[PDB]
Amino acid sequence: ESADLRALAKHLYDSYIKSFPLTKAKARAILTGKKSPFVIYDMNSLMMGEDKIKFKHITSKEVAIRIFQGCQFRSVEAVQEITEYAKSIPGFVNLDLNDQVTLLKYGVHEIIYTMLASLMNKDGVLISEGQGFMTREFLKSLRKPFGDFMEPKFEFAVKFNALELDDSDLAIFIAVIILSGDRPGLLNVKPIEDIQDNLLQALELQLKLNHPESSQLFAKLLQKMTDLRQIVTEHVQLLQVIKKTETDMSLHPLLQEIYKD
Amino acid sequence: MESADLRALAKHLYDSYIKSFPLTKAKARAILTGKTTDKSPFVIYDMNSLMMGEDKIEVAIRIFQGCQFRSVEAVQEITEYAKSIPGFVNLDLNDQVTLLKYGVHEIIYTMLASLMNKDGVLISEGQGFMTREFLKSLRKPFGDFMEPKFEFAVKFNALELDDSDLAIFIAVIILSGDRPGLLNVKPIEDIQDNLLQALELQLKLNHPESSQLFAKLLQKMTDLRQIVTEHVQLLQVIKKTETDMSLHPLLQEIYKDL
Ligand SMILES: O=C(O)c1ccc(-c2nn(C(=O)c3c(Cl)cccc3C(F)(F)F)c3ccc(Cl)cc23)c(COc2ccccc2)c1
Ligand SMILES: O=C(O)c1ccc(-c2nn(C(=O)c3c(Cl)cccc3C(F)(F)F)c3ccc(Cl)cc23)c(COc2ccccc2)c1
- What's the alpha-carbon Rg for chain B, to the nearest Å? 19
Query: Residues with Cβ < 8 Å from B122, sequence gap 6 or more?
Result: B23, B28, B31, B32, B41, B115, B116, B128, B129
Q: For residues A16 and A174, what is the distance between their CA atoms, to the nearest angstrom?
A: 9
- How many C-beta neighbours within 10 Å does residue A41 have? 16
Query: For ligand 2, is residue B34 a contact (CB within 6 Å)?
Result: no
Interface check for A201 against chain B (CB to CB < 8 A): the answer is yes
Q: Do A200 and B212 touch (CB under 8 A)?
A: yes
- A210, exposed or middle or buried, with CB in 10 Å at 0-12, 13-18, 19+? middle
Question: What is the structure's resolution, reported in angstroms to one decimal?
Answer: 2.2
Q: For residues A238 and A151, what is the distance between their CA atoms, to the nearest angstrom?
A: 12
- How many C-beta neighbours within 10 Å does residue B212 have? 18
Among residues A257, A232, A237, A236, which one has the least CA distance to residue A113?
A232
- What phi, psi does B131 have (nearest 5°)? -75, 150
- In A, minimum Cα distance to B189 occurs at A220
- In A, minimum Cα distance to B193 occurs at A216
Encode chain A in three state secondary structure: CHHHHHHHHHHHHHHHHHHCCCCHHHHHHHHHCCCCCEEECCHHHHHHHHHHCCCCCCCCCCHHHHHHHHHHHHHHHHHHHHHHHHHCCCCCCCCCHHHHHHHHHHHHHHHHHHHHHHHECCCEEEECCCCEEEEHHHHHCCCHHHHHHHHHHHHHHHHHHCCCCCHHHHHHHHHHHHCCCCCCCCCCHHHHHHHHHHHHHHHHHHHHHHCCCCCCHHHHHHHHHHHHHHHHHHHHHHHHHHHHHCCCCCCCHHHHHHCCC
C-alpha dihedral sign at B98, B104, B106, B107: positive
Q: For residues B70 and B67, what is the distance between their CA atoms, to the nearest angstrom?
A: 5
Distance of CA A117 to the CA centre of its chain: 7
Q: Produce one character per residue of B164-189: b if its CB has 16 or more CB atoms within 10 Å, e if not.
A: bbbbbbbbbbbbbbbbeebeeeebbb
Residue closest by Cα to atom 28 of ligand 2: B146
Q: Which amino acid does the sequence have at B220?
A: K
Number of residues that this document lists for chain B: 258
Q: Is B16 annotated as a binding residue?
A: no
Atom of ligand 2 nearest to the CA of B130: 38
Number of residues that this document lists for chain A: 261
- Of B57, B70, B238, the one to substitute when testing ligand 2's pocket (max ligand atoms within 8 A of C-beta) is B70
- In A, minimum Cα distance to B227 occurs at A230
Residue closest by Cα to atom 28 of ligand 1: A150
Q: Output the CA A73–ligand 1 centroid distance in Å.
A: 8
Chain B segment 146-165 residues within 8 A of A by beta carbon are none
Strand partners, B128: B42, B123
Q: Are strands B42-44 and B128-131 parallel, antiparallel or unpaired?
A: parallel
The Cα-based distances of A52 to A38, A46, A49 in angstroms read 9, 10, 5
- What's the alpha-carbon Rg for chain A, to the nearest Å? 19
Query: For ligand 2, is residue B67 a contact (CB within 6 Å)?
Result: yes
Q: For residues B37 and A69, what is the distance between their CA atoms, to the nearest angstrom?
A: 67
The Cα-based distances of B33 to B40, B81, B111, B115, B151 in angstroms read 10, 27, 18, 11, 20
- A170, exposed or middle or buried, with CB in 10 Å at 0-12, 13-18, 19+? buried
Q: Is B137 annotated as a binding residue?
A: no
Q: For residues A171 and A136, what is the distance between their CA atoms, to the nearest angstrom?
A: 26
The shortest CB-CB distance from B218 to any of A197, A223, A229 is to: A223
Query: Residues with Cβ < 8 Å from A232, sequence gap 6 or more?
Result: A109, A110, A113
Q: Which amino acid does the sequence have at B246?
A: S
Q: For residues B196 and A220, what is the distance between their CA atoms, to the nearest angstrom?
A: 9
Q: Which amino acid does the sequence have at A21?
A: P
End-to-end CA distance of chain A: 40
Q: Output the CA B228–ligand 1 centroid distance in Å.
A: 28
Q: What angle do CA B162, B163, B168 make, to 5 degrees?
A: 110
Among residues B246, B237, B13, B231, which one has the least CA distance to residue B109?
B231
* Helices B163-174, B3-20: crossing angle, 10 deg rounding: 90
Strand partners, A132: A38, A127
Q: For residues A42 and A134, what is the distance between their CA atoms, to the nearest angstrom?
A: 9
- Give the domain range for residue B226: 2-258
Residue A174 C-alpha, separation from nearest chain B C-alpha, in angstroms: 15
Q: Do B212 and A233 touch (CB under 8 A)?
A: no
CATH of the domain at A95: 1.10.565.10
**Long-range contacts, B32-36 (Cβ 8 Å, 24+):** B32/B117, B32/B122, B32/B129
End-to-end CA distance of chain B: 34
Q: For residues B184 and B177, what is the distance between their CA atoms, to the nearest angstrom?
A: 8
Among residues A57, A28, A245, which one has the least CA distance to residue A148?
A245
The approach used to solve this structure was X-ray
Ligand 1 pocket by Cβ (under 6 Å): A 55, 67, 70-72, 74-75, 78, 109, 112-113, 115-116, 119, 125, 127, 134, 139, 150, 153
- Of A40, A74, A230, the one to substitute when testing ligand 1's pocket (max ligand atoms within 8 A of C-beta) is A74
The Cα-based distances of A105 to A79, A109, A135, A192, A243 in angstroms read 9, 8, 30, 15, 20
The shortest CB-CB distance from B212 to any of A182, A201, A219 is to: A201
Query: Residues with Cβ < 8 Å from B152, sequence gap 6 or more?
Result: B109, B113, B223, B224, B227
Among residues B133, B130, B137, B100, which one has the least CA distance to residue B115?
B130
Q: For residues A36 and B40, what is the distance between their CA atoms, to the nearest angstrom?
A: 75
Q: Do B225 and A223 touch (CB under 8 A)?
A: no
Provide the number of structural domains found in chain A.
1
C-alpha dihedral sign at B111, B115, B121, B124: negative
Encode chain B in three state secondary structure: CCHHHHHHHHHHHHHHHHHHCCCCHHHHHHHHHCCCCCCCCEEECCHHHHHHHHHHCCHHHHHHHHHHHHHHHHHHHHHHHHHCCCCCCCCCHHHHHHHHHHHHHHHHHHHHHHCECCCEEEECCCCEEEEHHHHHCCCCCHHHHHHHHHHHHHHHHCCCCCHHHHHHHHHHHHCCCCCCCCCCHHHHHHHHHHHHHHHHHHHHHHCCCCCCHHHHHHHHHHHHHHHHHHHHHHHHHHHHHCCCCCCCHHHHHHCCCC
Query: Residues with Cβ < 8 Å from B76, sequence gap 6 or more?
Result: B250
Q: Output the CA B12–ligand 2 centroid distance in Å.
A: 28
Q: For residues B249 and B244, what is the distance between their CA atoms, to the nearest angstrom?
A: 16
Q: Output the CA A94–ligand 1 centroid distance in Å.
A: 31
Among residues B203, B251, B258, B217, which one has the least CA distance to residue B79?
B251
Q: For residues B189 and B192, what is the distance between their CA atoms, to the nearest angstrom?
A: 5
Q: For residues B120 and B2, what is the distance between their CA atoms, to the nearest angstrom?
A: 42
Q: Is A85 annotated as a binding residue?
A: no
Which ligand does the CA of A242 lie closest to?
A: 1
C-alpha dihedral sign at B2, B3, B6, B12: negative
Do residues B17 and B163 lie in contact, with contact meaning Cβ atoms separated by under 8 Å?
A: yes
Q: What angle do CA B146, B152, B155 make, to 5 degrees?
A: 140
Q: Output the CA B143–ligand 2 centroid distance in Å.
A: 13
Q: For residues B199 and B166, what is the distance between their CA atoms, to the nearest angstrom?
A: 9
Q: For residues B140 and B160, what is the distance between their CA atoms, to the nearest angstrom?
A: 34
Do residues A178 and A110 lie in contact, with contact meaning Cβ atoms separated by under 8 Å?
A: no
Q: Output the CA B75–ligand 2 centroid distance in Å.
A: 11
**Long-range contacts, A90-93 (Cβ 8 Å, 24+):** A90/A8, A90/A11, A90/A195, A90/A198, A91/A191, A91/A194, A91/A195, A91/A198, A92/A178, A92/A179, A92/A195
Q: What angle do CA A228, A210, A33 make, to 5 degrees?
A: 75
Do residues B1 and B191 lie in contact, with contact meaning Cβ atoms separated by under 8 Å?
A: no
Atom of ligand 2 nearest to the CA of B146: 26
Query: Residues with Cβ < 8 Å from B196, sequence gap 6 or more?
Result: A216, A219, B172
Q: For residues B67 and B249, what is the distance between their CA atoms, to the nearest angstrom?
A: 15
